[PDB]
Every structure is written in structure tokens, then in C-alpha cells.
Amino acid sequence: PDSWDKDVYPEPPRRTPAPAPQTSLPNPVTYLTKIFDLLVDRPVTLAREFIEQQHAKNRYYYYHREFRRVPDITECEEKDILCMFEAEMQWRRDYKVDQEIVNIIQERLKACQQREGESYRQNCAKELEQFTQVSKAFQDRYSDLGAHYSARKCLAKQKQRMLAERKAAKEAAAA
Amino acid sequence: HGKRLFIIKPSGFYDRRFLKLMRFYILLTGIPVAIGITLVNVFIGEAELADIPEGYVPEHWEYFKHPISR
Amino acid sequence: GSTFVAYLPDYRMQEWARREAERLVKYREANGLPLMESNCFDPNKIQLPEDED
Amino acid sequence: NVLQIVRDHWVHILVPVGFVFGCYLDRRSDEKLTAFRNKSLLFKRELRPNEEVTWK
Amino acid sequence: MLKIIIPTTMLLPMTWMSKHNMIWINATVHSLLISLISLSLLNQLGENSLNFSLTFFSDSLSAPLLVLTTWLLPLMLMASQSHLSKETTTRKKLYITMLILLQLFLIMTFTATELILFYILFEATLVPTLIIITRWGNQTERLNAGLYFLFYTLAGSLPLLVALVYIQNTTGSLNFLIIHYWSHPLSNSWSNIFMWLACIMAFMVKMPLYGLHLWLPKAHVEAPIAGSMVLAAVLLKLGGYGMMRITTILNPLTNYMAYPFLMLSMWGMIMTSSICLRQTDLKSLIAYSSVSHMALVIVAIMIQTPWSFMGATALMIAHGLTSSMLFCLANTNYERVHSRTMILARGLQTLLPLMATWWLVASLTNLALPPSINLIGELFIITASFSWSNITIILMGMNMMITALYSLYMLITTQRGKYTHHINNIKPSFTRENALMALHILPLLLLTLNPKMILGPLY
Amino acid sequence: AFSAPAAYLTHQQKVLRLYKRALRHLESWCVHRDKYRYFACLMRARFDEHKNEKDMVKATQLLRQAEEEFWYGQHPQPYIFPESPGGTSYERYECYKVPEWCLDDWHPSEKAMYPDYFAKREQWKRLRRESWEREVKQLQEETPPGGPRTEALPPARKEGDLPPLWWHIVTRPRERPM
Amino acid sequence: SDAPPLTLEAIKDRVLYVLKLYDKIDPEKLSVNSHFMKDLGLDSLDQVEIIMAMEDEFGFEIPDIDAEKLMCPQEIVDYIADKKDVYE
């Protein structure tokens, strides 16, 4: 279905076997699915086509809202309230987008586990490893902020993380 | 056998009357709402996503999908 | 009022976040960028204080 | 009968009058916070040919 | 915000100019209309807030509380219509005036951009409730109950005024937005410790925190039905809302300051749940159940995590609705029996089946049966506490089991068994009481369909 | 149940009660009918040996070791009739018992149904209203001074009189109303 | 359930049947009103066994305080009818 992007939600080609009846006995599954088709799928398709033509009779559009980029908290003055407000709003929007990215990766992982069946432990290493990276990044950015989170606290956490990394690199190089 | 006896029990009139009244009013307003929602869904709604044409700025209610939300 | 609350427009911006995340993941997977980045702000713009201990 | 039921039903109009007055007062108080209209760095927009204010 | 405030103010002249036999109808109709207007506030944004003006703002933490406050008044009027039948018109109008003034104070309290205005209204709510308790109260202990309720609150909240004026003298502002944006850490100092205590104790005493909960059983048992409804539904949530608003400036002092209160709440939920098992009064049992729920809400607020805050908001709303319904059921029994004792009237399911159904649904909702929002808040807070420490699960499970135990005990003692023989004045339940229970219970099951409306700003 | 209790139980009543309990528990132990008949006859033979004993002290010493022997071998799961205070259906139908005064609160649309029943009920009400006023004075004059010594009530002695305190004994709902 | 509505005649017939199956008491001598101690010369233990036989026959059990003062078949039938709410 064109309603979603196939690249964002990848799927295997879904190769399926062909019916190879070994006996002369007529299986009931085919007869039941044929009668199901006749008694269910046809009226549903007709109703859907009627509703779709009624929708095509009246067509109108809606648009995705685009947001400009604004200066972030790292380039705001100590007591400047306007730039702090703008940076806080931008950071909150970025936080929501990051959460939804993690949601997309988790959906991919769940779909892989269900689809691969009994061989999921081997055939879903790629999704698991992507989720490992995304979870590590997300955890670094937002963990332990608390209920009253803000861009300033995230910046302080990043600052202390970079100080620790710089100290470790200096100690390792000067070892 | 004509052994029909009397069953002593509390009055079920007021409970049944309250239930009927509550159902009557709830349906009185819910049936028109359901009919209107169905008519709107079949005839009008479910807009489709588009790209903003250059030089055009949309109004605030044009960023939503369902007609009732708009 | 229940019907009104059911059909409230998205001022919390959920599907907007979905579309933003979808386009960002499309861009990053295609360009080889590793999805989300560990640092929320670019380190070039932070001036750390030199310790000299 | 008009001019008789009014003397007993005049009270009903009061809550509704209060609501419209409160809406008017909300808009009037809103009118005093326009110092940054079309000046936010996020929604800084050029006016339409027949537009004086981005929002009211 | 004035589109809600002005009609509530106009409720007073409408009530005082109403006919002697048309006060209840007009008050109920216009209160319901005001509630409909309040529904518009629920639409909320993921961004900062709904900043209407310099004086008032709305948020997804304040919006559900405002909606509940506006919705509660018609129910309180319906409950009060019965026992005030033999009252003079002037005194009934005074009662309605007290209820309207309390609603107005609560509405202005929940918006309150500035903290001193919040304190002023948070204290202004104290007078109408006191008058309602000590004037239209049945027993002779209502005076002592009102004294307890007044003095506990005032002793708790007097240091809060000093703390607030000191904070404004130092920082320069008490507007919540500036306070949030210009927040600074608190150094571990004795002066900062006492400032933390002065900021916290006023809201702790009204939760009520275990050991400071003595006023609540007295006030709830001695109050009339409308007073009990409002006290259990809205007045208890003022402390939680204040703590959620004020814990932004108490960091990082809260990490170690919270332990005495966390231990008190975690043990006190068990204590009060066990107290509920041995109780001879319905109202006292419901009050102690409220104490347990609010102690668990205190734990949630003290943990100070996003899941904690969402669970606390959901549990506050659900507890308000459930406690109001339980108090209304107890009052329906009391107005028939005039005793307020569990063991006197027994086996009421045989005589009143629909009211027994209402009892069962209320007990199931208090028991936190999924997927009710009661369990949503309960489970979110339990998960947050488990992340805080894996050993909390024992206390949480004990509390859950005891809660189910006394809820079903209260249901079985009053509804099941054999009817009392000598009680023969148990008339069929009126349409008013049934409608009251229905209007209490249906919003809960409708809200469980849209839980995001009551999960607060951190959703 | 119906009979008023006495201030105490005599020796003979206690002996009968032990005999009944022992027979019931022996029947519970001995499922089969012929075995139960044999052991019940043997129990009766062992039981009536001390029938003719005369002095009170040895009689009181007996029945006591008998009760201890009964308690040692009392079959911790005896047979119980379903309607007994320990049976599987002791209070099964108590939820279907509705008092008679509940009919006084029926809606007139409900009382339109069953008109003869309500006419008879009104006649019963009139009878009770007169009989109670007679019964109060009858019980006042018949009771010993200083209060009753036992919870036994006297019957009616006049022609039109009814037994005192009869309304709530005659108008029991039923054993199985539904 | 499907339980037939037993009547006074059935109760009396069953009581007299069980009594006539009691070899200690002669069938001819006994009468609905025939007393136990004096008219038939039975012991009190015989009375309690008669009560137990009634209990096993009718499937319900009589309390001891009521049983110890049931001395004639007629009043036994009356007690059973009062307990089971028999009309006729």
C-alpha cells in the first residue's frame, strides 16, 4: 500500500510456496475460502468502491507543518528569556521526534520477530543491532533528566559527558 | 397444576423506569450524532496529504485530516 | 462533550512527529548516517573550561 | 404569556450573558499582548497583500 | 479563562434572585452548562501551555482538575437536594452560595500564574468548607472536626507564605514560567533544608501525609454529603498539584530530603489499608482508603519521574471520582437508616438490586480493576517505584491485596447475607440517586477510552 | 428451633444427646446399612447396661469418659444433611426471602396486578391491627411481676383472641419462595 | 428440582409406614394419636431412634430440643408439615 513508505518500513519479498496436492481428496480449506470470498469479500469491495467514488466526488487537502530552525540553548545569554523560550520549544520538538524515531525502530524489531518465526534469533540480528545503537543514543541524550527536564539540564549532562571523555582520552594518550 | 403461588419481591418499577429514562435520553442525543458522523464519513471526509504550493501559506485548520477536527 | 473530546484536533502534534521521524530516518539510512546522534548539541559550539590540573 | 413569564424567567439569561462577557473580556485582554505579533523568529512571516495582522 | 470565571460568578445573583421553588433546577442546569464550557480547555499542546493572560494559564495538569471541579457541582447539588428539604429558602440559598464560592476559588486556584495568588486562593478555599462543615453538620463533633481541619492546614501553610516571600525577595519573581526557566540548584545547606521543609509541609499536610492525616477522618465523617464529596474529590488534590508545581525549585535537595516522607507514605498505605479492615463506619473506611491512595500519590510525586507524574495525575482524577461515588452511596444508605454503621443494615442487594450494582461497580473501580484509569495510575506509579528500587514491590503488592480485601469486605457486609428483620423503612431507590451514581460512574469508563486526557503534561 | 430453651440441660437430656451424636457418627463411619445396623445394636447394648444405676456421682462420672471417647473417635468429616447448619445447602435460598412489608411500597401499576391478593393482605392487616391491641393488654396482665422468667409465650384464652406476637411467625416468607 | 408437592396425607402415610416397620411396636395397637411412653410402652431411647428413622425417611433433620418433645405420630406429622410449609 502506498499509504506508507516501504523504505521506512522494509519488508522481505515474501516468497510463498505453491499448492502441491499429493492426494485426490478435496481439501476443505480451498472450498471454505472460496465461499468466504463470495459471501464476504465481494460486498465489502463493492461498498468500498462506492465510498471511494463518493470521496472522489469531494476532494480536499491537508498539509504537513514545517518548522524553521532557531538558535539553540548553547547560544543564549544567561538571563535572556526570549531566546531561552525559543530554544526550549525547539528542544522539546526534537525530543518528540527522537521518541518517534525510537518507536519506528521498535516497530521494525517487533515485525521482524513475528515474521521470521522460529529462526528469529538469527534472522533479526540487523534490527536488534540497529535498536541497540538507537537505544544507546537515546539513553545518552535523555536519561535521568527527571520530571522537570529542560534544554539546560540536557546541555549540562552533555557537558559533563564530554569532560569525562576528554579526561579519559588525555589520560589514555598520556599513559 | 393450579398451584401458582405469589412471589414476594421488591418493586421493580422505579429501577426499570430509571433505566428506560436514561436509555431514552442517551439514545435521543446519540442517534443523531451517529447518523451525522456516518454521513460525514461516507460523503465528505478523509482528506489526503499534500505538499504546500510555493508562495501559499495555509490557515491553521488546514493542517488536520478529519473534517470534524478541521 | 464526549464526541467533542473524541474529535479534538491534534494540537499535541503526534502525526507531525511521526512524519518528521519518518523523513529523518529515510534521509539518514540513505546517506549512511547512523540514525540518532549521541550528542544533542554539536560539540563545536560548546566551549569547555580548560582544567590544567 | 410574554411580560408575565419574563418576571419569573428573567434569571435564566444571566449565566449566558456572563459567558459572552467573559469571551469579550478574554479577547480584550488578548489585545494588550501584541508586542511580538509577527516578530517571533519561528513564525516570522511576510504579510499577505490584504493582511494587516497575522492573528487577532 | 474568564469565559469560565464570569458565569460562575453570575451563578450567585441567579441563585439569589431565583424563585423559592426553582433554585435547584436553575443551579443544576447552569452548572452543567458551565461544565460544558470547561471541556474546551482539555485540548492541550505538547508545547509550553495555554497562557491566556498575565494572571491565568491552563495546562494539561490543570485542565482535568478544572473539568472535574466544574463537573462536581451539579452532583453536589443533586446530593444536597434531599436532606435540605425542611430548610428555609434563605439558608438553602446560602448553602448554594457556599458551594459556588468554593468552585470559584478552586477554579482560580488551578490557573494561578503567580504563586502568591495561588496561596491566597488555596487558603480562600478554607472558609466555605469550614462554614459548610460546622453549620450544616448533623453531629456535635462537627465543631471539633472543623477546628482540626482549620488548624492543621493553617499550621502547615503559614511557613509557606514566609518561604514564598523570601523566594520572591531573592529570585525576584514568583511567576511560574520565570521560575521554571530561571531555576537554579539548591545547595545542601541548613537554610535550604528548612526552606525545602517550609515549601513542602503545607502541601504534605493536605494530601494528607501519614501521621498528619488525623483531621481527614473527622472532617469527612462530620461533613454533610456535599462537603464530603468536595473534600474527597478536589480539596485533597490541591496538595498534589502544589507539590508538582513547586518541586521544580527544590532540586537536587529533594533526592535525599524525600526519604522521611517516602518511608512514611510507603508504610502508611499499609497501615491505613489495614485500618480499613477493622472499621465500623462506612465514612471512616472510605476516608482511610482515600488516605492510602493519597499516600501512594505522595510516593509518586516524591519519586519525581515522568511515569510517576503521569500515574499521579491519573490516580488523582480516578480517586476523586471513585471516592465521590462511594460517599454518595454511603449517604444514600444513611438517609434511610440514620445510623452510619456497617453492621446494622445488611443484605441490601435483595431489597435494592440496582443500588447493589452501583455498589459493585464502585468497589471494583476502587479495587483498581483493569483497564480502569485507577489501575493505570496505580501501575505507572508501581513501575516508577520499582525503577526507583526493586524492594518497593513488596509494599505495593501488600497494599494492593489489602485494598482488594477491604473493598470486597465493605461490599459483602452491606449488600450480601440476610436482611435485618426490624428495619422496614427501606423505600425503593429514587431516580435522583440512580442518576447521581450513573453520572459518577459513566465518566470513568469513558475516560478509560482516552487515557491521554488525564496523563498530565509529561505525556 | 421453635421450642423455647430451658435454663439448663438435665442429665437425661445430655445422655440422649450423646446417644444421638454417637449413633450419627457411627453411621458416618459405617457406610453400609447392615454393618451400621449391627454396630448400632451393639452400641445400644453397650449404652443401656448402666440404665438402672441409681446414685448421681457415678452417673456423672459416666457420660464423661463417654464424651471423651466420642471426641477421640468423632469422624472428623461426619455426614450432614444438606439443609443442616453445616450442609452444602444450608442458606442457599436465603437470598430469595423478601419481607412482607415490601409489598407496601409497590407502585399502584404493580398493585393493579393481583387485586385479590392485596385485598386479602388488607384484611390480614386489619386483623393484625385489632389483635395487637388485644395482645398487648393480655400479655401485660399475664406476665409475672418483675419480668418474664422464660421466653415462652402463652396461647390465646378468649374467643376472638389471637396468640400474642403472632404476626412475624405466621408471615414467614417461605422455605423456598423461588 | 422436579419434587412433587407432598401433602399431609403423604406425610401421615409415610410416618405410619416407618412406624409399622418398627418391630418393637405392634402395627394394630398404634394409632395416629397413640402416645409413645404410655400407650405403646417404649423407652426414651426408642423415641430417639424413632426420631432418627423419621429423619432418614424425610431427608431433613430435627433439632434435639424440638425432637425430645415429639411424643405422638400426629404431632410429628404436624411438626413436619409446619417445617416444610404443607398446605393440605
Ligand SMILES: CCCCCCCCCCCCCCCCC[C@@H](O)O[C@H](CO[C@H](O)CCCCCCCCCCCCCCC)COP(=O)(O)OCC[N+](C)(C)C
Ligand atoms: C448497556 C448494554 C449494551 C448497550 C451498548 C452496546 C454498544 C457497545 C459500545 C460501548 C463501548 C464499546 C467500545 C467501543 C469503542 C469505540 C469508540 C472509540 O473508538 O472512541 C474513543 C473516543 O472516546 C473519547 O475520546 C473519550 C470520551 C471523552 C471523555 C470525557 C468525559 C465527558 C465529560 C464529563 C465530565 C468529566 C468528569 C471527569 C473529569 C476529567 C477512542 O477513539 P480514538 O481512537 O482515541 O480516536 C477517535 C477518532 N479520531 C481518530 C478521528 C480522532
Ligand SMILES: CCCCCCCCCCCCCCCCC[C@@H](O)O[C@H](CO[C@H](O)CCCCCCCCCCCCCCC)COP(=O)(O)OCC[N+](C)(C)C
Ligand atoms: C509527626 C508525624 C510526621 C510529621 C512529618 C515528619 C517529617 C519531618 C522530618 C524532617 C526531615 C529530616 C530533617 C533534616 C534532614 C537532613 C539530614 C541530617 O539530618 O542528617 C545528618 C545530620 O546530622 C545530625 O542529624 C544533625 C541534626 C541533629 C538535630 C536534629 C534533631 C533529631 C530528631 C528531631 C526530630 C523531630 C521532628 C518533629 C519536630 C516537632 C547528616 O549529617 P551532616 O553531614 O552533618 O548534615 C548534612 C546537612 N548539611 C550539609 C546541611 C550540613
Ligand SMILES: CCCCCCCC/C=C\CCCCCCCC(=O)O[C@H](COC(=O)CCCCCCC/C=C/CCCCCCCC)COP(=O)(O)OCCN
Ligand atoms: C503540620 C505542621 C507542620 C508545620 C511546618 C513544619 C516545618 C516548618 C518549616 C520550618 C519553619 C521556618 C521556615 C523557613 C522560611 C523560609 C526562609 C528560608 O528558607 O531562609 C532561611 C531561613 O532559615 C531559618 O531561619 C529557619 C529557622 C527555623 C526557626 C523556626 C523553627 C520552627 C520549627 C522547626 C523544626 C520543625 C520543622 C519540621 C517540622 C516537622 C513536621 C511537624 C535562610 O535564612 P537567611 O538568614 O536569609 O540565609 C542564610 C544565609 N545568611
Ligand SMILES: CCCCCCCCCCCC(=O)SCCNC(=O)CCNC(=O)[C@H](O)C(C)(C)COP(=O)(O)O
Ligand atoms: C462413633 C462414636 C464413639 C462412641 C462412644 C460413645 C460412648 C457412650 C457409652 C456411655 C453409656 C451411658 O449411657 S453412660 C451412664 C450414665 N448414667 C445413666 O444413664 C443413669 C440413668 N440413665 C438415664 O436416665 C437414661 O436417660 C436412660 C434411662 C437410658 C433413658 O431414659 P428415658 O426413659 O428418658 O428415655
